[PDB]
Structures are given as C-alpha cells and as structure tokens.
Design a protein around this ligand. Structure first.
Ligand SMILES: [Mg+2]
Ligand SMILES: [Mg+2]
Ligand SMILES: [Mg+2]
Ligand SMILES: [Mg+2]
Ligand SMILES: [Mg+2]
Ligand SMILES: [Mg+2]
Ligand SMILES: [Mg+2]
Ligand SMILES: [Mg+2]
Ligand SMILES: [Mg+2]
Ligand SMILES: [Mg+2]
Ligand SMILES: [Mg+2]
Ligand SMILES: [Mg+2]
Ligand SMILES: [Mg+2]
Ligand SMILES: [Mg+2]
Ligand SMILES: [Mg+2]
Ligand SMILES: [Mg+2]
Ligand SMILES: [Mg+2]
Ligand SMILES: [Mg+2]
Ligand SMILES: [Mg+2]
Ligand SMILES: [Mg+2]
Ligand SMILES: [Mg+2]
Ligand SMILES: [Mg+2]
Ligand SMILES: [Mg+2]
Ligand SMILES: [Mg+2]
Lengths: 181, 130, 49, 258
RNA sequence: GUCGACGUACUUCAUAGGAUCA
RNA sequence: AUUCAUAAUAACUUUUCGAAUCGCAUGGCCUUGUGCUGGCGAUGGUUCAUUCAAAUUUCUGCCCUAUCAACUUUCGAUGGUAGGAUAGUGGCCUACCAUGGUUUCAACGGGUAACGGGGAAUAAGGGUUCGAUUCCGGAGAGGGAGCCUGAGAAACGGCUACCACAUCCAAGGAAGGCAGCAGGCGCGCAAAUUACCCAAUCCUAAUUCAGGGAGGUAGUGACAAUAAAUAACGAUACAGUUGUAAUUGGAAUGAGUACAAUGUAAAUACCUUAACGAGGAACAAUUGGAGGGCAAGUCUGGUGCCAGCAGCCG
RNA sequence: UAUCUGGUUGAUCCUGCCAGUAGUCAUAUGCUUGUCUCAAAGAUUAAGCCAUGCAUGUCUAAGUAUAAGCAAUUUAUACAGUGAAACUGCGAAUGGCUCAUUAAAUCAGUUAUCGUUUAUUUGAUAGUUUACAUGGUAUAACUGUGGUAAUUCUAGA
C-alpha cells in the first residue's frame, strides 16, 4: 500500500476550561477579534505554547551551543518575519514574553479592519470570506491568514471584486435592469 | 488579451522535443482552451500545430492565471511516435480503439482457456453426437 | 433501519430494467431470511390464487 | 519467501535516491549487475528524477530502446540497470557525459565531465588471484575481471581502466598521504588524505582520514577509495570537493549567494 | 436442603471541633 | 591462519562441455569459379569472479508461574571413531563405544485474549501499557502426511492419500478449497461496489507494443485530521441611551443550477467562469443542562383561606 | 487528586470532614450532518463455511507455419508480409492476504562460511574431439474414425 500521509491536531483542550477568568478572557478575545468559536483561541494558544516551550528548551541549553544558536536564530527570524516579534527584541527571552493577542492581531481579519477597508472585524470577515480581499495579486478568503510584514502593504480590494474596479455584483445589475425596464 | 510565457525550457533531443512550463495570463477570462494554447505555441516556436502537446493545466485560486506543461516536437512524425495514445486521441491525431470492457475480455479469455486446440473437431463431434 | 439495502434502477428498455441490477436484486431476495412475527405465526391465512 | 524477490517498496528503497513517498507504492528494483542494490542508481532514477529528460517510466523505456544511453561505453536497454559509483554515462544525442560520484550530502550527483575524462574510469581492486591455467587476474569493485595484471597491484589499490579496451592503464597503491574518497557510512561523499591505517587481524581495518580543513575522521577500510595523490586526483571532483560544512556555515554561504 | 467453610462482588454504622451572638 | 588459488604425475567415467542455431547487410581478393575471405547483432555453452538470493551460524537480549525442583538418557539425551545421507558442517541417521549434558545466576513443566521489531499513548523524571493493522523478517493457505517439476516450492488460484465438510450424477462415476478483489452465511436484529482502468508506480514475458482485482480512479455510515459559510452596512418604529422588530433602503456572496473551458485513460469532483441563485434571507444548526409562570383542572395530607406532588387533560 | 458548588446548627466566622465536579484513549450506542483538502476500512481468541464472476500469462528483424487463415503478388517455384492452433523457452517460488502455531523458537543489533547451492545480470573464458551439415531410434497442432450423462476427460489410425 501507499505510504502514509502525516496529519496532526492544530489545537488542544485547555487543562481547566471552566475557570471563570478564562471564560471572561475568551469572551473578550472573541468579541475584540470577531472569532467564530473557542476553537480558534485554543488553536492560537496551542501554537504559542509550542513556540514558548521550544524557546524555553533552547534557553536551557548553554549559550554558544551550536544547536541553541541555529534553532534560536531560525525561530526569532520566523517570529520577526510574521510580525509577532519586533526587530529590536531579537532574543529568546522576549520570545517567552509573547501573548496570544500578538498572533491574533496579525490575522488577515484584524489587518483588513485596521487598514480601513472594513468598518468592523465582522465586516472584515465577511469581506474576506466573500473574496473581496487580495494580498498582492492573490485573492485570499481565509480570515486566519497570517499577514507578513512585507505582505502588510499589499492588502487591497481584489481586481475581480466589485469594490476593486470590477463590474457590479449580481444585486446591483439586477436592480439596475429592473429600474431600466 | 492573453499572454503565454514558457519557463524552465529544456531541449530533449533524446525524445526529440522541447519541454517547458506554460504560464498563461488570461485576465477577464475563465481559462484558455488547449486548442488555442497549442496554436499560439506552434506560432511562437515555428512548428506545426500537430507537433505541440499541452496538458496539466490548473487555474490558480482566484483566477487570472494558469500553469501547465507543454511539449514541442521537432516534427509531426516524432510526435506521433512518442506521444501517448490518449493525448493523441485528445488532439484527433489518432482514433480511439474500441474494445470490450475488462470483464468481457477476461471471461472470454477464461472460456478460451477451457478449450484446447482450434476447437473445430469439438464442434463437429458435438454436432454428430446430437 | 440504519444500513438498509437500497437498489437503484436507471432506465427501462423493452419494458425491462437493466440486467445487472436485477441479478443483484434477485440474489438478494434468494439469500433472505424472514423473522417470526407474532400475528402471522398465530393465525392461518391464505392469498387466493 | 520461496525464492528471490522481484518488487521493492518505496519506503524500503535506498534513501539517497530521493524518491517521493506519495508518488506510488513501488520503486524501481535495480536488476542484477555490477553494483550492489543499495549502492546503485538505476537508470530510470537518473534519467527521470535527476536529469528530468523523461517524465515517466515509459518515456525512459522509449529513450533506452533508441540506444541513446551508454554505460561505461556499452549501450544498455534495461530501465533498472544498476549504474553505480565511478560509472560513465554517455548520451551522444545531447553530447553529454556524466560520472556518478557522490556529493557531500551522500547522494549521487549530476556531475558532467569531458570526453577525454569519459574515456576512462577508476576501480578499487577487490581481489587478486590466479585463474585457470595459472593466469593472474584482478577483480575490481564493479565486477570487472582483468587478466594479466601488473604484479605490483595488490588489494585496496586503485586501477585506472580504459573503457575502450577495458585494460589497466595505470594504478595507485594504498599508502599514507594518498587522496581518498569515502564510499560508505555517515562520512559518505567526503574527500581527504590517509594519515594512518590501523590494522586489526581477524577484524575490520580502520583508516584515519584528514580533510583539507584539517578535520580528522575514522572510517572502515571497506568504504575507502583511493583516487590519487594529495591535490592531484585522477578524476574531476564535484562541486565542494568533498568538504563537509556545518549547518551554520551552509546557512551563511546560502544567504551570501542569495 | 431458606446446609457449613472458603473465594468473589457489594451494602451499612460509627464527624464534627473552637470563638462569638440569642 | 589452510590440505588455499594454481600447477604436475598415474589412471578412472552407463560421464559432461568444446555452436549441425537465427536476424540484417553484401564489403575485400583474385588464377572468373554460384571460388577464397568477411561486418553488426540475437540465442545457447564450460569454468572462475560479481550481482540478486538461499541455507546454516557466533555473542547478548523475551510476559505470568517455585503451592512447577530436579530434568534429559529403554524409542539420541552429551561426546568420540567410521560410515550413510545432504548443496554442504552437524546425532541429521546408522554401527560400536564411553556416561555424559541442563539447573535456585530458576533448568524442566504449565499459562498466554504470545507472530517479533521499527513504532503509539501517557508521564516532570523514573516507569506503565498498547503494537492483527501502510516498512522489515517469520509462519499458513480447512487439519495431518508425502511428493513431481524446476536455479529456487515440501507450492496448495500444483498433485496424491487420510480426517471433516460439501457440489453434479442417467448412481456407473466426476469435481473441491476466498487467511486474494468484489459479494454472501454464521440470528430472528442488519453497515463499502458482485463499479471503471492499466493513464501513473512498478512487476512478468520471446518482450517499447500483451498481461497485472499488484496498483490506481470513482462510489459508500461524521474512523482519524485541515480550513470554513449560515449574513454585513444603515434608517424608521416601539419599550424602560439601553433593549426589541415576520418594520424598512440598496449593496455583497456562495450552497445549488448551468453554456463553456480545464481537469481525467474516460468520467465525477476541485480551481476558473457566461446566465440564474436572498428578508421569514422558509436557501427554515444541532446536541445537552438549569430555571420559571399561567386554570372555574387533577391527586395526597392536615392546628381553617394552607403545603406537597405535579399540571399536553380546563 | 486540584479548582468550584453544596451539607455538616438557634444563627455568623475559623478549621476539619463528607458528596458532586478532571482527563485523553478504547468499546457500544443515540441525535445532527451544508462547503474545500485528506485519509482508513480487522476482531464471536469463528485460521468458522462459501453460490457467482475475476485475480498469470507471455513473440521480437532475430527458435518451429504448405492454417485447405487474411492481404498483398509476380520480391521473390524452397520460405520470405501479418498470423489463429500447437511444439519450444521463460514466468507461474514475485505480488496480495491472515496472525493459527511458536517463550532462546521467531525477531533486533552483531558475527561466520577456510562449511555450502546460486536461474538471471555484469567481466573474463574453450586451435587439442556426411561436415557445402546426420537420424526417427517422432510427435504436437492438423485430417479422419469414436466412447462417456458429465469435466481444462480423451482412445485408434
Ligand atoms: Mg467572482
Ligand atoms: Mg575475515
Ligand atoms: Mg562424520
Ligand atoms: Mg545410534
Ligand atoms: Mg503482544
Ligand atoms: Mg495466538
Ligand atoms: Mg505487529
Ligand atoms: Mg508456505
Ligand atoms: Mg476458512
Ligand atoms: Mg501444501
Ligand atoms: Mg484461493
Ligand atoms: Mg500463492
Ligand atoms: Mg474478500
Ligand atoms: Mg528469440
Ligand atoms: Mg444515526
Ligand atoms: Mg442550512
Ligand atoms: Mg463551490
Ligand atoms: Mg507465408
Ligand atoms: Mg512449455
Ligand atoms: Mg511454554
Ligand atoms: Mg539465541
Ligand atoms: Mg530471464
Ligand atoms: Mg555470461
Ligand atoms: Mg499417431
């Protein structure tokens, strides 16, 4: 038979889901960023936990260790590239200082809201899922799309979208035809 | 308009052709037919349309561009010699051979396996018996 | 019930269904077994021929 | 099993072939030939996954049946012929010649050579013995039996073989200071110079090799292949000249060139 | 035979103590 | 490291091998003859080496059991000599010999819902458990036994017998092995298609071409996993700057339908895309839990008008 | 276990105790089930029994065609293209499936063959024994005559 294809879980249930403070924190996060469910928050928390555990394990290694140098430099480069970590904080200690909000801000939903293309996080989500947002020349319909620093300046309305210079949607030309008739 | 660009061009004299990756920009169009791409590539490479093969075209998410693979044979005879039969059938260069389904052929094979010899002697034997 | 057999018949040719599916249906009936029902096993009945 | 096997699973194939794990369920089993199964590169992998001339096995067969491929100066038509180390592959239509030499990573590299360098190869003398009628002969690492050898040729030496006639033109003794190429183990693909051969009777002899950067490593004698005197190899060497570079140095160079 | 011994599985009884107030 | 490679002498052999084979082409010598010579290949053939393998083999490592302490040795158990047999070492077997071999550092016997490993889970670490199941190796083809062929089989989609089942029959005979792919029974209670194809992966052959239920393609119970729609922006209205709308405005879009093209061996689907596709956006999201309130209603109890049960029923 | 909730009296604090609340994985099962990518399908310790179909055949210029086969023809009065059947060669000992037996057995790592077989591939290797080329000591396919209810049964010439 053919060789297996790998798969993995991108989220995990927290140790105590029922903590009242935790429930309030999830409520605030979902409301601020317009997240659909607690699964997305768990996903970002799982990613952050993985990153911080890797950073801690590297820190346990003695300085100048080739493994520490190579892996820590790669990790810091990735975090700086995605935008979570600022340029001036290029150390493993500041990697442990990251928070879920830093990742959530980089989502294409929040970026579309912030850049002024949308009036709310929910309006940004609707614009994304309806194929109105293009990062460069590529239409992206995934709200969880993580925007890189270089990609940040190229978010715009898609060429095919009615807002981006294409013809009006079905409703607009429908109403125009009915008015004309 | 439509723009066709050939990338990663390799010249394969072993198979007597040129291989490449065809990237098609087709703004305001669903996609480009293999016929039109073959004609345009033949015009570009100064070959007969019969000698141009194109396949594996996928339109990128969001539309506007397609990527596929293309072959340009040195002349038509080499194309007929090397090209797969199914692709030739697609282009009309060869006619589809009509054959029974695999189950029919396999059952016929087994029935013939049961018979020994030409079988004419068996036929006349059963005829005389009955 | 969950998982019940459901047979699919495509078209009628010469007032007959496709041969393959009827063969499948015919075999399915053949190997079938019937439960004992309370009423039918307590009363005598007969379908007039 | 009740006899020899004829199939090879992709996951069971040699790693250095670099085969996709999802492309299929089977991999080309190298037919019997000069080189062992795990130390060989079948022509299908070379023509398809390395040179990219052929897009599928059928096209490889079409190429071979046209008799366009020569291995060591002789035309081969078998898809899974086990081409291996130091084998010269000639494609006359493309006017191209290749020598199969490991790169530092441990994988057969696409190394192009000149026609003059394609006229000969090198062979490690695996055995030296008298045949029938008292005619001495040498058996090399590719299974070539060459009769009437120079008496000075002993085991572990490297003989330069002319492909046109298959005769020994020159030979190199195994001694300290000789340039060697590692053909097995985790140091596969490295080039260095012998420093000392540690001899153990009834066991495996170990050789200490010093590379150009002064690093030293120990390898079993079976994996060593003499290729010339220091700085003067008898064959053109691949890019990097068999020098291992740490991951950090590779990163630095890659960023520099990019 | 509402029999004895053992093995196994269960049920049940033993929880309030100090300080202030009325 | 050898009685090794190799060589020599004397013979021996139901005794072998040393081309009575095939395709394409028609070159060179001459004393001019269908004379002499001669090219590129295929297939066989002895031996050696190599490759694919096989067989045997050295060291170390297995779960529970001591309320299993002695076991093996008559019928090989330990070893020696010679033979036989094997491809070959060898108690592998035979004949004659000795009396040896294992064991509280657990032999031997018993249990195993015991194929072994790479691996999986958990855990802070030590540990504990799982591993029929994508790779490797072993064993089997209903249960024992024995073989022909062949380089390779103790083969079972090869053969013969016996044991158990079981099909056809004119009763004389004949034919069997799904722990292969589909699909049935094993209950009276249940679960993938008796689908398409060699296009890719590789395998077999005299062989580029034929074959391949190996394998791929699609179909089919939410196996295990990834992403992610079910609305967004306003105005008006009503009620205690908050809440509620079968109120209302024109913009957005895919679920679905479908010219087409791409995809594919041919198809389906995906990615594209003309034209349709939204207010109850009825294009009608689910699974659990908690708490109410209502009567000319019903039942039970009693320090009056109350309390409990409860209330789809007035 | 932790956290949280509740009970421990005439009430409120401070202790202690008691009850419920944790977990993924596994089995069975219930309700719901729109889109994209991807992927698996065991289990009565029953390795229990199987209707039906298929799953192993194979020809190049290069072993054997007077098929009373096809089509081309005077490129062919030995043959010459293609070619059923049969002989010959190879494969069928690979692949696929299941985990019954098996407790120093298998298997893992590591050794040995100076202890042996090896089709095939690859390289070498054979002036030493009517020939302008020997037989049936011979048959298949095929022609023709037949037996059997029946089989991938086969008898005589
Ligand atoms: Mg659009
Ligand atoms: Mg040795
Ligand atoms: Mg002996
Ligand atoms: Mg004896
Ligand atoms: Mg186990
Ligand atoms: Mg068992
Ligand atoms: Mg296992
Ligand atoms: Mg077996
Ligand atoms: Mg069975
Ligand atoms: Mg058997
Ligand atoms: Mg079978
Ligand atoms: Mg078998
Ligand atoms: Mg089955
Ligand atoms: Mg032949
Ligand atoms: Mg259900
Ligand atoms: Mg819905
Ligand atoms: Mg869609
Ligand atoms: Mg003829
Ligand atoms: Mg035969
Ligand atoms: Mg035991
Ligand atoms: Mg052992
Ligand atoms: Mg063969
Ligand atoms: Mg040979
Ligand atoms: Mg006869």
């Amino acid at each position: 038979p053919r060789a297996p294809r790998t798969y993995s879980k991108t989220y995990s249930t927290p140790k105590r889901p029922y903590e009242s403070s935790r429930l309030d924190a999830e409520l605030k996060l979902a409301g601020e960023f317009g997240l659909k469910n607690k699964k997305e928050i768990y996903r970002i928390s799982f990613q952050l936990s993985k990153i911080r555990r890797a950073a801690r394990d590297l820190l346990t290694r003695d300085e100048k260790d080739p493994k520490r140098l190579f892996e820590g430099n790669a990790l810091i480069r990735r975090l700086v590239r995605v935008g979570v970590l600022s340029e001036d904080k290029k150390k493993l200690d500041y990697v442990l200082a990251l928070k879920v909000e830093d990742f959530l801000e980089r989502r294409l939903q929040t970026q579309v809201y912030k850049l002024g293309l949308a009036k709310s996080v929910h309006h940004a989500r609707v614009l994304i899922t309806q194929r109105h947002i293009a990062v460069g020349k590529q239409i992206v319909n995934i709200p969880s799309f993580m925007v890189r620093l270089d990609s940040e300046k190229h978010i715009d309305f898609a060429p095919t979208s009615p807002f981006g210079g294409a013809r009006p949607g079905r409703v607009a030309r429908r109403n125009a035809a009915r008015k004309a008739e | 308009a439509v723009t066709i660009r050939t990338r990663k061009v390799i010249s394969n004299p072993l198979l007597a052709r040129k291989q490449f990756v065809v990237d098609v920009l087709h703004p305001n169009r669903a996609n480009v037919s293999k016929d039109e791409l073959r004609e345009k590539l033949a015009e570009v490479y100064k070959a007969e349309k019969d000698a141009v093969s194109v396949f594996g075209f996928r339109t990128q998410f969001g539309g506007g561009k397609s990527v596929g693979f293309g072959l340009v044979y040195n002349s038509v005879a080499e194309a007929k010699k090397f090209e797969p039969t199914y692709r030739l059938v697609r282009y009309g260069l060869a006619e589809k051979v009509e054959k029974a389904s695999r189950q029919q052929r396999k059952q016929k094979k087994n029935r013939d396996k049961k018979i020994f010899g030409t079988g004419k002697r068996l036929a006349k034997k059963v005829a005389r018996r009955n | 019930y969950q998982g019940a057999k459901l047979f699919y018949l495509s078209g009628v040719i010469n007032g007959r269904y496709p041969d393959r599916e009827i063969l499948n249906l015919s075999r399915f009936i053949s190997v079938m077994k019937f439960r004992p029902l309370k009423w039918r096993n307590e009363h005598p009945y007969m379908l007039a021929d | 099993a009740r006899g020899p096997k004829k199939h090879l699973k992709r996951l069971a194939a040699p790693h250095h072939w670099l085969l996709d794990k999802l492309s299929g369920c089977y991999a080309p089993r190298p037919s019997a030939g000069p080189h062992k199964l795990r130390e060989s590169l079948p022509l299908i992998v070379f023509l398809r996954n390395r040179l990219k001339y052929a897009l599928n096995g059928r096209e490889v067969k079409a190429i071979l049946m046209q008799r366009h491929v020569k291995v060591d100066g002789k035309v081969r038509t078998d898809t899974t012929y086990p081409a291996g180390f130091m084998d010269v592959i000639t494609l006359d239509a493309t006017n191209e010649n290749f020598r199969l030499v490991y790169d530092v990573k441990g994988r057969f590299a696409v190394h192009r050579i000149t026609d003059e360098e394609a006229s000969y190869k090198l062979g490690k003398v695996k055995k030296v013995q008298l045949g029938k009628k008292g005619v001495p002969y040498v058996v090399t690492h590719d299974g070539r039996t060459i009769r009437y050898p120079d008496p000075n040729i002993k085991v572990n030496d490297t003989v330069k073989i002319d492909l046109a006639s298959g005769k020994i033109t020159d030979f190199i003794k195994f001694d300290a200071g000789k340039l060697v190429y590692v053909t097995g183990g985790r140091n596969l693909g490295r080039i260095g110079t012998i420093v000392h051969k540690e001899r153990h009777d009834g066991g495996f002899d170990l050789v200490h090799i010093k590379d150009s950067l002064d690093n030293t490593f120990v390898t079993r004698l079976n994996n060593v292949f003499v290729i010339g005197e220091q700085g003067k190899p008898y064959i053109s060497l691949p890019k990097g000249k068999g020098i291992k570079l740490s991951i950090a140095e590779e990163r630095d160079r890659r960023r520099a060139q990019q």
